[PDB]
């Protein structure tokens, strides 16, 4: 158990949330920079998201590809857990959405493809299904390139067409399927991909009321509507993954991804080339250091940093000494 906090430097606040934060951190004695995620395990256990958090843990110790955040550390001391990832330069892509309200079909296909990889890795290598796929979780790395991150959703030991149970998603992207709280399929990221891809074309969600019971009304019963500029494969596109029944939806049947990366709308896309990072981001971000800020929101990179500085055994029921927490990547 070599790395501690007192390892880093802690530069910038990046993101806040009810369960922790993530902070730009400096390896002091490399050099290199890092999202440092720091959660209070009291907070945790109080908020019932430990599975969520163990979860994340094995997932991102397990996985390796390209459009998927990596972890170089994982450690954890009496009152908090951290992970110490990959920064992703570039910002969320609700970040940058937000700013220029809609993207080219061009740029929203790269981002697609690279998304598509990713989930198609996930499905197909790792019987894993990410369920929570948002704006907010997609992020670029300093080269342009899609980092999908926060796995406390996954699902894992989802082979082929096994099914889950648990109602959770973020309320806005949630399937049918999974309001329905009647057991569900891999098919529900095809749904997010058909939400978030939806966002990045047409400038707005699919569904959406202020109110809840609205909100899942419009998503079970609501006939999907385009904007009428958009092009007749990305209709054909976006009709298909957001299919309300998942039988019937893109990506639905026993092919999984390969059904979609087959849609006209990928025509010309080689596959292999997308994972290999051979295609040239539409986007490439504008840092001019390693500690540029500029595509994070101000709200957060504002904040003051006060990181608190034995009880390396302490294990008790509102501070748990928790499992695999005693990672460095090989
Ligand atoms: N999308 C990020 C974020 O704030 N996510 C939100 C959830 C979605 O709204 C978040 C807030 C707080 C916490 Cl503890 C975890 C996640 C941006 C800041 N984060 C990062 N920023 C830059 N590089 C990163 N690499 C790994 C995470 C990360 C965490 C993910």
Redesign the pocket.
């Known amino acids: 158990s070599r790395v501690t906090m007192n390892e880093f430097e802690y530069l910038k606040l990046?993101?806040?949330?009810?369960?922790?934060?993530?902070i730009?951190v400096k390896e002091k004695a490399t050099g290199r920079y890092?999202?440092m995620?720091?959660?209070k395990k009291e907070v945790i256990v109080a908020k019932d998201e430990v599975a969520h958090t163990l979860t994340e843990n094995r997932v991102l110790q397990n996985s390796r590809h390209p459009f998927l955040?990596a972890l170089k550390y994982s450690f954890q001391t009496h009152d908090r857990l951290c992970?110490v990832?990959?920064?992703?330069?570039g910002?969320?892509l609700?970040f940058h959405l937000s700013r220029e309200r809609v993207f080219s079909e061009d740029r929203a296909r790269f981002y697609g493809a690279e998304i598509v990889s990713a989930l198609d890795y996930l499905h197909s290598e790792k019987n894993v299904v990410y369920r929570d796929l948002?704006l907010?979780?997609?992020?670029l790395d300093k080269d342009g390139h899609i980092?999908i991150?926060?796995f406390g959703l996954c699902k894992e030991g989802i082979k082929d067409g096994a099914t889950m149970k648990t109602f959770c998603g973020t309320p806005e992207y949630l399937a049918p399927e999974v309001l329905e709280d009647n057991d569900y399929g891999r098919a529900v990221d095809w749904w997010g991909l058909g939400v978030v891809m939806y966002e990045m074309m047409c400038g707005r969600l699919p569904f959406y009321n202020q109110d809840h019971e609205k909100l899942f009304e419009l998503i079970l019963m609501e006939e999907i509507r385009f904007p009428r500029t958009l092009g007749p494969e990305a209709k054909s596109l976006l009709s298909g993954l957001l299919k309300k029944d998942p039988k019937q939806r893109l990506g639905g049947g026993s092919e999984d991804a390969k059904e979609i990366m087959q849609h006209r709308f990928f025509a010309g896309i080689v596959w292999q080339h997308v994972y290999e990072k051979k295609l040239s981001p539409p986007f490439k971000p504008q840092v001019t250091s390693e500690t540029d800020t500029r595509y994070?929101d101000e709200e957060?990179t504002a904040q003051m940093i006060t990181i608190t500085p034995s009880m390396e055994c302490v294990d008790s029921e509102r501070r748990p000494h928790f499992p695999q927490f005693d990672y460095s990547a090989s």
Not at 14 to 22: A, C, D, E, M, R
Not at 85 to 89: I, K, L, V
Not at 136 to 139: F, V, Y
């Open positions: 990046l993101g806040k949330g009810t369960f922790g934060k993530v730009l890092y999202a995620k720091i959660l955040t992970f990832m990959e920064y992703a330069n910002g969320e609700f948002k907010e979780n997609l992020m980092k991150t926060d994070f957060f």
